[PDB]
């Protein structure tokens, strides 16, 4: 179909004995201008003459009592729908680029084994495994501090927990705030020091680290990542000129939140390069035809049948040794024979895993992945400079701009942990809004990110909440939505097909440790 045209809209919003107002015609005129736009592309179709909504919302704020309001309100609904027809019927090929991120430490072999599976089936794709060459010791310095944060916590605790994690975060913040002052100072005296220089100096002075054996970890980390596809380094001239950089350095150096710096990187790299981002815990999709002859038992969850598939493929083909048969080893030999026979009747990796190939997506969209708890950015697809990718970056940029207008005042007062939290909570409660009510609540937990349970701030800043907020800005014809009011059935429009990714891997299945009440006093017993 299409959208309603000028004659049609004239029928809907007609009121007998009521002439056409100056602004009512502005809507009819722009709508007619729209349907004479076949020579134009998708992007400037979406705005140049597909706002309309603007000229419509103008009519409803001038003539608040007009009869046509009820009809034009439905007209705005047909505009959201036409945007989805635009997204689904005009698709261009996607850049054959695959993006991974490993920053802060040495890449371990399990991550390389998962990446090598994408290269073998998709031999027509560039593989970039982004790393920060200047910050290999950010994971090393994070461990050292919390290690020492417990030695000093238990030193003054001669008689529980809760009070443990409470009085531990106070120490971590002081050792954190101490390092940030050393960094901001070292960078002033010597602008030529990189992050790694400052960290091995701080780790050697205040923690007696064999710095002889530290510059070895740096040499091995680069030698490893550089011969495994690499295609990266702290390069990116367009990422460093962009406003999103000192946001990434803030989560990296001032915060030691390795993942939150990756959340900022992935969406910016997709917008500037194009391609498809994946966490290193993801595996290529399985050929949909492979195990159709092995009926799944009706007394078994769907997730179980999904992991057992990958575990079987890794048992009789051994692409990845040391992959657990943990879930496969619980079927009778009547069923394990069904897998071994099917894994015999294939002889190539691309007979088992589906390749991506010539993918295509819309210039407006950024395709996001799904699980049981909503959208998740363990897999993203976007064409270069897609309209959604720009909205997600402005959304994350806008959300951090809010975070720092209230947090940086309290950091500058250099008090302890609790006086700084009280100053920071009032500042978000001051410049608070009725729109961002759901947002500013999760913001108060920001200092505890990485060191406590029940902290959902990272999600509301540069995670799923920001992506959905960008999808709303797309579908509501606005920018800067803070309160999500899109239903789940709406967001599945930007879903990534289950046959392009394999999520139930051993790895991202092994990163579901709850760390809450189901822990109960434990882990402290480890500390001996």
């Amino acid at each position: 179909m299409s959208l309603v045209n000028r004659k049609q809209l004239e029928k809907m919003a007609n009121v007998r004995f009521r002439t056409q107002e100056d602004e009512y015609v502005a809507i009819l005129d722009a709508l007619e201008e729209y349907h004479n736009m076949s020579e134009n592309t998708v992007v400037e179709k979406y705005l140049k003459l597909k706002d309309i909504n603007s000229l419509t919302d103008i009519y409803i704020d001038t003539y608040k009592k007009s009869g046509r309001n009820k009809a034009l309100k439905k007209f705005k609904e047909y505009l959201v729908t036409e945007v989805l027809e635009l997204k689904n019927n005009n698709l261009t090929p996607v850049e054959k680029n695959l993006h991974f991120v490993w920053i802060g430490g040495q890449i371990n072999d399990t991550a390389i084994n998962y990446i090598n599976q994408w290269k073998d089936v998709n031999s027509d794709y560039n593989v970039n495994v982004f790393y920060d060459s200047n910050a290999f010791l950010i994971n090393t310095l994070k461990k050292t501090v919390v290690e020492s944060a417990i030695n000093d916590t238990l030193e003054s605790f001669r008689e529980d927990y809760n009070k443990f994690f409470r009085k531990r975060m106070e120490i971590i913040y002081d050792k954190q705030k101490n390092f940030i002052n050393y960094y901001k100072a070292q960078r002033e005296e010597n602008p030529e020091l990189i992050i790694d220089d400052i960290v091995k100096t701080y780790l050697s002075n205040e923690y007696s680290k064999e710095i002889d054996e530290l510059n070895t970890y740096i040499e091995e980390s680069l030698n490893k990542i550089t011969q495994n596809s690499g295609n990266d380094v702290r390069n990116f001239e367009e990422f460093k000129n962009g406003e999103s950089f000192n946001l990434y350095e803030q989560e990296l150096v001032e915060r030691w939140n390795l993942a939150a710096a990756s959340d900022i990187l992935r969406i910016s790299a997709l917008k500037e390069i194009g391609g498809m981002y994946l966490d290193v815990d993801m595996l290529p999709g399985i050929q949909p035809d492979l195990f159709e002859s092995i009926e799944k038992p009706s007394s078994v969850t769907v997730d179980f049948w999904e992991m057992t598939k990958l575990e079987a493929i890794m048992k009789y083909k051994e692409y990845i040794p040391e992959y657990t048969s943990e879930h496969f080893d619980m079927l009778d030999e009547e069923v394990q024979s069904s897998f071994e026979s099917v894994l015999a009747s294939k002889s190539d990796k691309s007979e088992i895993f589906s390749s991506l190939g010539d993918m295509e997506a819309s210039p407006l969209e950024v395709k996001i992945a799904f699980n049981s708890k909503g959208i998740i950015n363990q897999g993203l697809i976007s064409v270069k400079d897609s309209y959604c990718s720009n909205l997600i970056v402005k959304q994350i940029e806008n959300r951090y701009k809010i975070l720092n207008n209230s947090l940086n005042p309290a950091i500058s007062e250099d008090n302890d942990f609790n006086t700084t939290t009280n100053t920071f909570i009032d500042s978000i409660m001051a410049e608070a809004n009725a729109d961002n009510g759901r947002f500013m609540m999760e913001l108060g937990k920001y200092l505890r990110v990485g060191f406590f349970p029940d902290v959902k701030t990272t999600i509301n800043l540069s995670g799923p909440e920001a992506y959905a907020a960008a999808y709303q800005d797309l579908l509501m014809f606005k920018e800067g939505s803070m309160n999500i009011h899109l239903i789940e059935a709406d967001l599945r429009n930007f879903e990534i097909s289950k046959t392009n990714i394999s999520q139930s891997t051993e790895q991202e299945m092994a990163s579901l440790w709850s760390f809450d009440d189901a822990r109960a006093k434990a882990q402290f017993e480890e500390y001996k």
Partner: antibody
Framework: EVQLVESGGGLVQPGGSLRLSCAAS????????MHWVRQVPGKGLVWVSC????????TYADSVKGRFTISRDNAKNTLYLEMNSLRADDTAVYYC????????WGQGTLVTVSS | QAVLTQPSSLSASPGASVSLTCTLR?????????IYWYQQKPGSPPRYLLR?????????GSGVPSRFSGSKDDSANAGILFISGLQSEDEADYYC?????????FGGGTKLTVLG
Amino acid sequence: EVQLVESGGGLVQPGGSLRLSCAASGFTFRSYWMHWVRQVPGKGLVWVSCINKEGSSTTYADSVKGRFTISRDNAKNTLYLEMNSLRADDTAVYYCLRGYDVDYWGQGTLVTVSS
Amino acid sequence: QAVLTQPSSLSASPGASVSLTCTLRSAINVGTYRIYWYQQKPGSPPRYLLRYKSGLDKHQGSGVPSRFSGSKDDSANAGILFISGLQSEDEADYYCLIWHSSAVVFGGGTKLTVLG
């Protein structure tokens, strides 16, 4: 191991017709676009026609517009090119190649148009 | 000129390093496209080689030696094909690609003669 083997080329009267057939193996014959490219023996490469993944839209070169038709059968993993109203210009070797950003080439079948 | 233009032919001695250019006329065209390189050793069909569009949007065909590399020299709008460590097994014809107003356009071809 991706292999593409075309056939159907031979010798035709100027004005006759031919049906070239590139058969695909080793990869998912869907998932990818396809092209036809001709090379007059002893000269450069020249593009002819290109078909979608699904065969919904197609683009032809200005030389063969109207005279040529590209066709794609995703079942029988095979591509087609139907050449009508043949000139002597069309005498060349015709290759089929794979992907939007184009990767792998075929053997090439020779087509001669002489009287 | 002609959308996308290459030199006729060039020769060099084994071991030397060469750079082929695929220039493309000025105007509605710059260096924000991909450059697809191809090698056709005579008597055989072409071989995929490289794809370079940017430092992060580059590719080398499976089996292409690491001595082949591509970049783009600005100010001249041209794409480049460095071949360092030349050998007699590299004597062939070389073509580039570009996606234009839809369709896809080739270059003239460079008859590289490695005299060994």
